[PDB]
């Protein structure tokens, strides 16, 4: 609780069109999914995220993480509400949405250049580096959770699952399957799992493809690593065509980082410091 604003529930209900759960593109306030709503408070646009006792301690858990973790490449928590029998968290609004939607060019946005993509990748790595340095594991690293501010600065978001480290195991396996390391899928909690997930992200950046596509072969993006290793295909075959500034050398350099991140065995993966350095040298 490092000087966050305490909101009453009615204030946030007011500014969100009464928590209008319809997508924004269809006239509502939902920008994603608790559920996350767009709101206008005090000349500012904000992001409002809306067992009883156990939801309360997760609510308290995230505030704890957000109090301790402040960084240019992390979404900043602005405040909260806990009086309308319905818990809310209020964050800095990121106008350019998620990396996922920018890679897909959702709603007709311009394809991201290779230069911008490298900057976002570096930003994301810097954000993850801060978390690991400060002994946190994100647990849900993915392109939908890399948000983009006014200047397309990468902002790591959705810390609802984040855990402090001192490898432990959990009974409640959480995360996004198409991004999850094998050990994470088996209930292990380790920062090495974040690295693996970041490798999938790097693949999405290179290819512009989503991590999963039920009508695609392979359905999982991470499987393209094996197709390339068993030289059936090249990374060149998979490079996003919606760029004109992607030189072979840096693309191959990024793929090399991605491939190392995606080692099936957690101990053979680079840590975030090495990932940071490698993305620097690519540039």
Swiss-Prot record:
Places the protein is found: Cytoplasm
Domain of life: Eukaryota
GO annotation terms (biological process): cytokine-mediated signaling pathway; innate immune response; interleukin-1-mediated signaling pathway; interleukin-33-mediated signaling pathway; intracellular signal transduction; JNK cascade; lipopolysaccharide-mediated signaling pathway; MyD88-dependent toll-like receptor signaling pathway
Molecular function terms from GO: ATP binding; interleukin-1 receptor binding; kinase activity; magnesium ion binding; protein kinase binding; protein serine kinase activity; protein serine/threonine kinase activity
Location of the Protein kinase domain: 25-279
Family: Belongs to the protein kinase superfamily. TKL Ser/Thr protein kinase family. Pelle subfamily.
Disease: Immunodeficiency 67: An autosomal recessive primary immunodeficiency characterized by recurrent, life-threatening systemic and invasive bacterial infections beginning in infancy or early childhood.
Name of the protein described by the UniProt record: Interleukin-1 receptor-associated kinase 4
The organism of origin for this protein: Homo sapiens (Human)
Lineage of origin: Eukaryota, Metazoa, Chordata, Craniata, Vertebrata
Portion of the parent chain present: 162 to 458 of 460
């Amino acid at each position: 609780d490092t000087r966050f604003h305490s909101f009453s529930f009615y204030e946030l209900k007011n500014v969100t069109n009464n928590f209008d759960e319809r997508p924004i593109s269809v006239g509502g306030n939902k920008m994603g999914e608790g559920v996350v709503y767009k709101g206008y408070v005090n000349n500012t646009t904000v992001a409002v995220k809306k067992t009883t006792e156990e939801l309360k301690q997760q609510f308290d858990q995230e505030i704890k993480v957000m109090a301790k973790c402040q960084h240019e490449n992390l979404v900043e928590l602005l405040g909260f509400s806990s009086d309308g029998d319905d818990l809310c968290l209020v964050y800095v609004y990121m106008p350019n949405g998620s990396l996922l939607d920018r890679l897909s060019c959702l709603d007709g946005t311009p394809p991201l250049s290779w230069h911008m993509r490298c900057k976002i990748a570096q930003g994301a790595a810097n954000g993850i580096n801060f978390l690991h340095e400060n002994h946190h594991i994100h647990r849900d690293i993915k392109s939908a959770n890399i948000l983009l501010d006014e200047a397309f600065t990468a902002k790591i978001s959705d810390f609802g699952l984040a855990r402090a480290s001192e490898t432990v195991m959990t009974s409640r396996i959480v995360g996004t399957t198409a991004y999850m390391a094998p050990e994470a899928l088996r209930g292990e909690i380790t920062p090495k799992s974040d690295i693996y997930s970041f490798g999938v992200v790097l693949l999405e950046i290179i290819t512009g493809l989503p991590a999963v596509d039920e009508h695609r072969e392979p359905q999982l993006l991470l499987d393209i690593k094996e197709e390339i290793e068993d030289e059936e295909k090249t990374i060149e075959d998979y490079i996003d065509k919606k760029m004109n500034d992607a030189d072979s050398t840096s693309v191959e350099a990024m793929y090399s980082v991605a491939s190392q991140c995606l080692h099936e065995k957690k101990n053979k993966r680079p840590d975030i410091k090495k990932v940071q350095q490698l993305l620097q040298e690519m540039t």
